[PDB]
Nucleic acid binder design. Structure first.
Ligand SMILES: [Zn+2]
Ligand SMILES: [Zn+2]
Lengths: 149, 248, 99, 127, 764, 50, 375, 107
DNA sequence: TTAAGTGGAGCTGGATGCTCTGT
DNA sequence: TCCAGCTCCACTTAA
RNA sequence: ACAGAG
């Protein structure tokens, strides 16, 4: 777990120092740069991710867990904790992705999709309980807050 | 904000450990007001907060320390006149861990919820060895119960609090100072407020039931306010304090 | 949303209608960007699709260049003529006298 | 304890001591023979069909290979799971209708497991 | 130095699509059903016998399926096309003909073709009229050359038996309980009986639980019931390590507290715990020989091979409690897929047994009572027991079989004809096991075991995200093998029998077990020679090419899986850093000298499996090959399925965008087929002037999408105009819509029946 | 809402009191801030910020 | 490598082939043998081999608590009955052993007494495992319980009671035990050997390695090949090696029974040598002065009329005349099947065969200069 | 420890006789008199020591004529040997040097 | 010796998002 | 699939 | 009862 912190430190240096090297060569009147400076749609991470370097793909906080025995895919050697073999995508969205990087990116995206799809039964019941418990409260004329009874 | 929280990652309370339930299940655990929750934390402040030598004494004073974790070899000895179990305390690792335990303390830690062994059955022949002569339990048990105590006696506690799972010394980063707070993943607030060396006037908790049982209803109200507002802040949301105040 | 695939489908289709090809967009391969940039310059267009545009309301040219090309748009089944709906008052249920 | 190999077993039983040792060897299911006028179907030819005589030559090679050359075919010989319990090779004789003799012949410690070399039987005519 | 590259390596994939994968899975399962399984079910039900009045018997001999027919008003019979059965709202079936041998006093009376039922014939199977035809002869049947098939026709609608996803039977699942304890379980399912057994460690001592016993009985009493009476042999079969004996000790100490030291005492203890349906001993001995661990066979009440198996279970629980290596259910070596044939086998078996029971009831009613004139049962062969059973179980979508306790719902769906991709995308769906019970978030994710077997992006968006999936482009689902030569080969490769040893050899460091679908074939030393020799015998054509092998080095097992319904995928063999396929081989494939089966025979292309590519090392491209690589990927665009093979440059997008296109691409307006005008459906959307795409994937050429497309090429400027295009809105052109852009047609339906009642009157 | 095949509902009140409780309480000009913290929600969006 | 060490001869013995068992004790280690214990009985049933031994444990040793032996003998035996009784005295003196069967067939296991220089094999008759019996505790429980307190289709063969009634019909066979230390044990240990020469050639074991691979691994209940090459040796340069022509000249001799030999030499393959492929092609069919046509005994109604009409292909270059076609004695219905598709019609000349006298004398081959008339 | 009867292979229990303690079977007369000292040592796992010695602990292993540390060549360093697991492990040696403008950790 | 008040363990009963759009 | 009440049973004190 | 859509 010490090694994981050093690798997630070093692989976040590559994304940040590669994404601060694309924003120094973009001219003004670039369209995503204008749309990120005015805050309308987008951010700097999106520009630096579809120009320079897509970041480390993380499923629930850590690197890509092993699905097979002691490795992530059959395409990598066993017990290897390399950057590329556990979810780091060295390419951007301009130069395309490789098959293992595309599969890891899809693993990282399906978690967002399934949290969006699980959230609906996760929150509305809680709001139903809060409304059925709180709805009798009313600020009165003598500046109190009293219940129904 | 329950629909807005994507149940995000990267949350460790700044220690790269001590995983905490945040997001929608944290608000769910607060408003359900249950008696026991996953991942409790009792954050304690130390009074003489200058040096780490003071912090590890009170760390070992509350953390669960097992007898099998301080004994170098635990053996049965069969004899032509007797049979017993012999435990030699590795006193070097007692001296390094800075603990208040010797053979007379281990004798007192035995006879607390173990098979009803008698205090006469346990002797203190040296300053390390502690022999336990077994008896007949006589309630669905044979005298060959030495195999029960051979794996059961290393699960008795000699120093610390029984409910605390683990603990970690936590530091700050600011340049003005360097002081040592204490993160206790446990479920006994009254025990951490009572050990010598822990500033009991300034320690808190996550679980509202322990705060209600120890400090009262008004501190439980303040804990509900602070914890709902902390969970809402850690996910990029912002609620005026009058709403969480009305809920509490 | 970071769809760069639309930005390359547009350019590849534009460079493939000018000389009668079907540029492949095969997964993990396909026609590259460097081979469709050179088929636009050979036919007189810009090498990145962006074209000089005179506007149609004022008659004066736009400042930025606009990015022309054919994209394959498909029509979906969700039409508004089969989703418009309005009840003032009408038939009610039999058990619960509500619509 | 280290695990012994068949060349290390067939070296100690001739060089270290001349004393005889009872081996218990497992052969494959069909041995490369024909049932001699046994009222047949190309069925299994085992040791319950052959006669007495030299049935084969056992070839121990350099670098630990042990082969059982049983005619035109070279088989392969490997050690089995090492048994460490009491095995007794006994005899039972029913020399009469309801009474007879039981005799113990010795003990069995080591095991051999024989298997055809499918790579060498396969490389002559592939499929 | 660059490794040399074969550039025409792609051409194995259009050769693979001639035979296997891409609805040919459904066809190869339905032909498997109607060609072997309808004979094998009839074999195990070959004779019915009346209880009263013996020396009377009905004997089935041979069964058939035949050609599709229609039974018209005036008893005239004629073959029929599938489109006539689409229009008239009738099923598309063929009469089941069976010849029998019965007794009317005269002891041998036989028939030749007795129609007992009608089997719904799936399209483009072996008995359909569409197979083996030329594209100009589909015109006389009103059928498309590109309509894939694999769907039924029942009462006018098109229904698809979907692919199910089920866990593998006869396998030891070592898992955690709700309370934190670690136990094991194995769903011992055979053809005759399904039942789950357990292994609970609730007090630190091992208990066994079952649906027959009213209380969980300790495991040492079960060992003493199964013929091993010494405690030493039981602890031998468990294990000989120190902590294993320490963990097992408090179970011997429980067994010695009771007076159980003898087999008859243990059976008398078990018989006092059996829920009642010679009692105490024999209802326990028949229980342990027929119901608990009912897939491990006992031959003549010899319980050795079941003792070894239950000791393997207890040892795996003991080793898994130390380090929490529980088995995940979501690894797809443990999932099996069940096609249309294996559901219709169960359905037809239950219907045929109910038919024989109804016929035996009629026989026992009219043999002892009525008349000395010997009746024949030909006058009681009612056809409407089998026909209406098949049609009602296909059309409604429930398969409630009382014999097998199977209570499934929602199997069949109506085949969607919105576009061409929607019909082809539905024939590759895999419904999941859990079916939306609770928000699991555990199997809804994307595990890495789905490499090349299932599609990454093609899933529905909403409540079924991850619970409805889709096959990849180059996958294959196996069927049940004959299981013959695998045991006869494994017995000649150094596998000792398991009976010839005590339990102490199981705990050796150099002794591995071998399994075959859950049963122990024995032990073996030098497992690498076993695995390599078995793979050479698989490549050389002796063992069938879908029999996988693997090695779990942690649990010390060498698995062999000859079972049916597991996912395979082809690969190119690599031997000492060079691919076995040369440019000469692909030139010989392009000129027509050979086919894909010749690549299978010559040890050039071999099928892998999800359990078997856990051992192997695969390179994606030829320049990834290093010295420890045994296989080469053929095409990496086969990772994406059928509906994601429309997307151009799909590796440049973000991953949810491909999912939203896999949702939208099944809903685009287009053209159904070449018979889209002679077709009367409930709802049909067409486009006026369709155009084929300008940037196209090779998957589009492989599934012939651009012969009948769905969409139009729009000239698109990308700019901000007029402010009516803020969030996803788009501004059209009035003079393009007037010229035919986006023009669509909507066809609907209105049917009306005019029936004649039981009273002789009629609608008019 | 996001205008991508999105449907929305409508409710016409039938009484004058239901009109006046909808216009004063539930107006868009009287609900420019969220009740949560008091931040404006009806404001500029994309192509009105760019 | 070469067999540098210990070319050990293997001999096969048969004198104990019906007598030799292998008993093994799963719960007794390999050091604490039963060589010293005084055995009492040795029982057997010869079919369904179930060997029950009995061994006597001594009493005067300190490992025999007599205070427990008196109690267990009082529990098992009647207190003073002794008419039929498991023990003779007032104590437990025996420990009875009960067998369980390992395998049914032992045709593959063989015991091996290795002497110097050679190794003798002897086939077993069975392997039995001998576990200590606990029947006397259940007999003690029996003495403790007797002190105080037109039928339908059936299945009995797969039950327990009929099984015990079927096994116990075999009467017991008693045997006299002779231990390892006895002098009879050395005398009956030499029947594991076989007397013979040092050089013995076996007229068995003649099967070639391909025949042995075919024998142990059988063909899958009979083979069916039609198209290894996707046209059956008929298209894709009209002949192709995926169905190997050198392995199977027969399939093209069935298919293309009329063809020039120069096409066969070009399409059979370059790697196969010349005189070997001439000997492969020559034996499968007839030849007519350099015209190879199918062996009619394999193709097709008798072969005698077929042999005489193949001689008619040798007689006249105008193959069969319409009267001589009747003389050659073919199937009169199948004259079009035998001659029409295989020849050329010219007017009033009968049939002109596809293959005239070709250049085999132009070919360098000297043996079918004279083989065609003896064949 | 489990010990099993050579006769029947049931599990032995310890009991007391008239002259000695005995291992005894429950199902056969076999007994074994404990004549001499017999033992069974578990050797369980001890605590981690990594974060226990750091930060100026009470070490004592330094001696007169002790070696200087290899980098600084001064004796301003502590060194110690400890068992990291149970005391059957051969003790490992470790040392740390702390000098002005110099911080290092070595093995 | 036993009456009694209170711990711990197993059983039981409840719950799990909002709508339209079609067959 | 997760979680509060209800009821049965050993476990000490006290007379 | 199933599939869609937001
Ligand atoms: Zn004993
Ligand atoms: Zn220093």
């Amino acid at each position: 777990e010490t090694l994981e912190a050093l690798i997630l430190k070093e692989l976040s240096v590559i994304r940040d120092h590669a994404g601060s090297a694309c924003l120094r060569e973009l001219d003004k009147s670039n369209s995503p740069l204008t749309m990120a400076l005015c805050g309308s749609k987008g951010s700097f991470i999106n520009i630096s991710q579809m120009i320079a370097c897509v970041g480390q793909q993380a499923i629930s906080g850590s690197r890509v867990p092993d699905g097979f025995e002691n490795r992530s895919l059959p395409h990598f050697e066993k017990h290897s904790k390399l950057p590329a073999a556990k979810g780091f995508v060295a390419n951007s969205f301009y130069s395309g992705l490789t098959p293992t990087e595309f599969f890891f990116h899809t693993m990282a995206g399906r978690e967002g999709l399934v949290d969006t799809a699980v959230k609906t039964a996760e929150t509305g019941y809680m709001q139903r309980r809060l409304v059925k418990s709180l709805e009798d409260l009313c600020s009165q004329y003598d500046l109190t807050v009293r219940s129904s009874t | 904000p329950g629909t807005q929280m994507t149940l995000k990652t990267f949350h460790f309370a700044g220690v790269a450990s001590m995983n905490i339930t945040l997001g929608v299940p944290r608000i769910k655990e607060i408003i359900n007001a249950s008696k026991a929750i996953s991942t409790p934390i009792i954050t304690a402040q130390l009074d003489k907060d200058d040096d780490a030598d003071y912090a590890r004494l009170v760390k070992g004073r509350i953390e669960k320390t097992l007898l099998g974790e301080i004994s170098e070899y635990i053996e049965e000895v069969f004899l032509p006149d007797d049979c017993f179990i012999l435990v030699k305390l590795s006193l070097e690792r007692i001296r390094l861990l800075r603990l208040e335990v010797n053979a007379e303390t281990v004798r007192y830690s035995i006879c607390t919820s173990k098979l009803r062994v008698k205090p006469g059955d346990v002797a203190v022949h040296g300053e390390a060895v502690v022999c336990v002569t077994p008896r007949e339990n006589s309630k669905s048990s044979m005298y060959y119960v030495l195999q029960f105590l051979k794996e059961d006696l290393p699960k008795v506690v000699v120093q610390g609090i029984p409910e605390v799972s683990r603990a970690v010394i936590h530091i700050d980063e600011q340049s003005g100072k360097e002081k040592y707070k204490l993160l206790v993943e446990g479920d006994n607030l009254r025990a951490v407020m009572a050990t010598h060396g822990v500033k009991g006037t300034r320690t808190t908790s996550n679980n509202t039931y322990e705060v209600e049982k120890t400090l009262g209803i008004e501190a439980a109200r303040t804990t509900i306010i602070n914890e709902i507002q902390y969970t809402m802040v850690n996910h990029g949301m912002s609620i005026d304090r009058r709403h969480v105040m009305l809920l509490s | 949303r970071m769809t760069v695939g639309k930005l390359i489908e547009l350019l590849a289709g534009k460079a493939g209608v000018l000389d009668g090809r079907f540029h492949y967009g095969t997964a993990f391969g396909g026609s590259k960007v460097k081979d469709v940039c050179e088929d636009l310059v050979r036919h007189g267009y810009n090498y990145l699709g962006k074209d000089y545009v005179t506007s149609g309301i004022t008659g004066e040219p736009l400042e930025a260049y606009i990015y022309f090309g054919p994209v394959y748009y498909q029509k979906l089944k969700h039409m508004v003529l089969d989703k418009m709906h309005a009840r003032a008052r009408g038939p009610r249920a039999v058990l619960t006298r509500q619509p | 304890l280290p695990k012994d190999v068949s060349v290390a077993e067939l070296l100690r039983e001739l060089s270290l001591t001349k004393e005889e040792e009872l081996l218990f060897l497992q052969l494959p299911d069909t041995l490369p023979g024909q049932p001699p006028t046994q009222d047949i179907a190309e069925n299994a030819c085992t040791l319950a069909d052959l006669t007495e005589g030299q049935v084969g030559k056992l070839l121990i090679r350099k670098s630990g290979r042990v082969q059982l050359l049983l005619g035109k075919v070279t088989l392969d010989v490997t050690m089995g799971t090492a048994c460490s319990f009491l095995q007794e090779l006994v005899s039972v004789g029913l020399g009469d209708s309801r009474t007879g003799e039981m005799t113990v012949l010795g003990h069995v410690k080591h095991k051999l497991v024989c298997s055809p070399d499918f790579e060498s039987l396969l490389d002559h005519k592939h499929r | 130095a660059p490794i040399p590259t074969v550039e025409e390596k792609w051409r194995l994939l259009p050769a693979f699509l001639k035979v296997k994968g891409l609805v040919k899975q459904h066809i190869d399962s339905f032909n498997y059903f109607i060609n072997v399984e309808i004979k094998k079910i009839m074999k195990a039900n070959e004779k019915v016998t009346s209880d009263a009045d013996p020396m009377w018997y009905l004997k089935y001999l041979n069964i058939y399926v035949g050609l599709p027919d229609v039974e018209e008003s005036f008893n005239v019979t004629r073959p029929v096309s599938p489109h006539e059965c689409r229009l008239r709202d009738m099923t598309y079936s063929a009469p089941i003909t069976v010849d029998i041998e019965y007794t009317r006093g005269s002891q041998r009376i036989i028939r030749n073709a007795l129609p007992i039922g009608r089997m719904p014939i799936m399209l483009r199977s072996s008995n359909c009229v569409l197979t083996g035809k030329t594209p100009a002869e589909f015109a006389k049947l009103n059928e498309c050359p590109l309509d894939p098939g694999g769907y039924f026709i029942v009462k006018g609608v098109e229904k698809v038996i979907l692919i199910q996803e089920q866990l593998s039977k006869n396998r030891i699942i070592v898992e955690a309980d709700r309370k934190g304890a670690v136990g094991a379980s194995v769903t011992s399912s055979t053809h005759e009986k399904k039942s789950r057994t357990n292994m609970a460690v609730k007090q630190g001592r091992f208990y066994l639980r079952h649906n027959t016993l009213s209380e969980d009985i300790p495991i040492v009493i079960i060992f003493k019931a199964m013929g091993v009476e010494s405690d030493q042999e039981i602890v031998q079969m468990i294990g000989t390590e120190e902590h294993v004996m320490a963990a097992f000790g408090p179970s011997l100490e429980e067994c010695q507290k009771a007076q159980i030291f003898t087999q008859m005492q243990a059976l008398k203890y078990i018989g006092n715990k059996v829920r009642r349906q010679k009692t105490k001993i024999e209802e326990a001995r028949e229980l342990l020989a027929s119901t608990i661990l009912t897939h491990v066979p006992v031959k003549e009440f010899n319980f050795r091979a079941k003792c070894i198996y239950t000791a393997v279970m207890v040892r795996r629980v003991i080793l898994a409690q130390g380090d929490n290596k529980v088995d995940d259910r979501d690894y797809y070596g443990n999932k099996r897929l069940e096609l249309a044939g294996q559901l219709l086998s169960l359905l037809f078996e239950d219907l045929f047994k109910k038919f024989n029971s109804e016929m035996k009831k009629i026989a026992d009613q009219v043999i002892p009572k009525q008349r000395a004139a010997q009746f024949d049962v030909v006058k009681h062969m009612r056809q409407d027991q089998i026909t209406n059973g098949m049609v009602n179980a296909i059309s409604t979508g429930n398969w409630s079989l009382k014999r097998f306790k199977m209570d499934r719902q929602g199997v069949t769906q109506v085949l969607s004809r919105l576009s061409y991709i929607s019909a082809l995308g539905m024939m590759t769906r895999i419904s999941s096991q859990f079916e939306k019970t609770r928000k699991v978030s555990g199997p809804r994710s994307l595990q890495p075991s789905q490499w090349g077997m299932l599609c990454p992006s093609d899933t529905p968006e909403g409540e079924a995200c991850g619970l409805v999936k889709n096959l990849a482009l180059m996958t294959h689902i196996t069927t049940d093998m004959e299981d013959g030569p695998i045991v006869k080969l494994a017995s000649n490769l150094g596998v000792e029998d398991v009976n010839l040893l005590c339990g102490e050899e199981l705990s050796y460091p150099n002794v591995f077990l071998v399994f075959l679908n859950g049963n122990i074939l024995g032990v073996i030393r030098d497992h690498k020679k076993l695995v390599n020799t078995f793979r050479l015998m698989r490549r050389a054509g002796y063992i069938n090419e879908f029999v996988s092998i693997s090695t779990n080095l942690t649990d010390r097992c060498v698995y062999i899986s000859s079972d049916g319904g597991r996912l395979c995928r082809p690969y190119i063999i690599v031997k000492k850093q060079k691919p076995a396929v040369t440019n000469k081989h692909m030139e010989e494939l392009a000129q027509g000298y050979r086919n894909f089966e010749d690549f299978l025979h010559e040890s050039l292309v071999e099928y892998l499996d999800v359990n078997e590519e856990n051992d192997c090392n695969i390179a994606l491209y030829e320049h990834t090959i290093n010295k420890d690589t045994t296989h080469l990927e053929i095409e990496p665009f086969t990772l994406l399925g059928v509906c994601a093979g429309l997307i151009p440059y799909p590796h440049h997008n973000q991953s949810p965008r491909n999912t939203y296109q896999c949702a939208m691409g099944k809903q685009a307006m287009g053209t159904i087929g070449y018979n889209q005008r002679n077709r009367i459906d409930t709802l049909m959307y067409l486009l006026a002037y369709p155009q084929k795409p300008m940037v196209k994937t090779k998957t589009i050429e492989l599934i012939e999408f651009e012969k009948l497309p769905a969409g139009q090429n729009a000239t698109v400027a990308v700019m901000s105009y007029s402010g009516y295009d803020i969030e996803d809105a788009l501004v059209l052109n009035k003079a393009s819509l007037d010229r035919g852009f986006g023009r669509c047609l909507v066809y609907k339906n209105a049917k009306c029946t005019l029936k004649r009642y039981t009273n002789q009157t009629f609608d008019k | 809402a996001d205008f991508d095949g999105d449907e929305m509902n409508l409710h016409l009140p039938q009484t004058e009191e239901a009109k006046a409780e909808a216009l004063v309480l539930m107006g868009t000009k009287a609900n420019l801030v969220t009740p949560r913290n008091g931040e404006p929600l009806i404001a500029a969006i994309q192509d009105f910020l760019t | 490598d070469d067999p540098v060490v210990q070319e050990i001869d293997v001999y096969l013995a048969k004198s104990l082939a019906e007598k030799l068992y292998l008993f093994q004790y799963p719960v007794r280690p390999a050091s604490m043998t039963y060589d010293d214990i005084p055995h009492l009985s040795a029982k057997i049933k010869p079919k369904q081999q179930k060997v029950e031994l009995e061994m006597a444990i001594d009493t005067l040793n300190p490992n025999y608590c007599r205070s427990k032996g008196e109690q267990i003998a009082l529990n098992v035996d009647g207190a003073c009955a002794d008419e039929t009784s498991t023990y003779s005295s007032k104590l437990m003196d025996k420990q009875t052993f009960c067998s369980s069967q390992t395998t049914s067939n032992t045709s593959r296991y063989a015991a091996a007494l290795y002497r110097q220089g050679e190794l003798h094999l002897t086939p077993l008759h069975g392997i039995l495992q001998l576990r200590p019996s606990f029947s006397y505790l259940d007999k003690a429980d029996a003495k403790h319980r007797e002190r105080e307190a037109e039928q339908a289709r059936q299945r009995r063969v797969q039950s327990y009671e009929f099984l015990q009634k079927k096994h116990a019909e075999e009467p017991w066979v008693h045997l006299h035990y002779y231990g390892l230390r006895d002098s009879r044990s050395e005398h009956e240990r030499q029947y594991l050997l076989c007397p013979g020469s040092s050089g013995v050639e076996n007229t068995e074991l003649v099967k070639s390695p391909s025949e042995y691979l075919m024998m142990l691994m059988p063909p899958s209940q009979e083979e069916e090949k039609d198209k290894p090459v996707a046209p059956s040796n008929v298209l894709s340069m009209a002949q192709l090696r995926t169905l190997p022509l050198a392995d199977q000249i027969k399939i093209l001799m069935k298919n293309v029974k009329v063809m020039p030999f120069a096409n066969l030499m070009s399409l059979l393959g370059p790697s196969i040598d010349s005189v070997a492929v001439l000997r492969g092609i020559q034996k499968v069919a007839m030849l007519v002065q350099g015209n190879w046509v199918v062996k009619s005994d394999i193709l097709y109604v008798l072969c005698r009329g077929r042999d005489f009409v193949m001689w008619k292909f040798t007689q006249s270059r105008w193959v069969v005349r319409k009267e001589v076609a009747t003389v050659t004695k073919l199937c009169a219905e199948d004259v079009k099947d035998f001659l029409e598709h295989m020849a050329v019609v010219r007017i009033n000349k009968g049939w002109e065969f596809i293959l005239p006298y070709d250049g085999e004398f132009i070919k360098k081959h000297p043996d079918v200069v004279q083989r065609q008339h003896m064949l | 420890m489990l010990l099993f009867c050579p006769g029947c292979g049931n599990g032995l229990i310890v009991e007391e006789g008239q002259r000695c303690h005995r291992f005894s079977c429950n199902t056969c007369p076999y007994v074994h008199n404990i004549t001499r000292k017999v033992t069974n040592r578990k050797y369980p796992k001890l605590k981690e020591v990594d974060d226990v010695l750091g930060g100026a602990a009470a070490w004592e292993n330094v001696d007169s004529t002790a070696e200087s540390c290899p980098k600084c060549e001064h004796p301003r360093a502590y060194f110690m040997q400890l068992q990291t697991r149970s005391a059957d492990e051969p003790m490992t040696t470790f040392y740390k040097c702390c000098n002005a403008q110099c911080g290092h950790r070595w093995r």
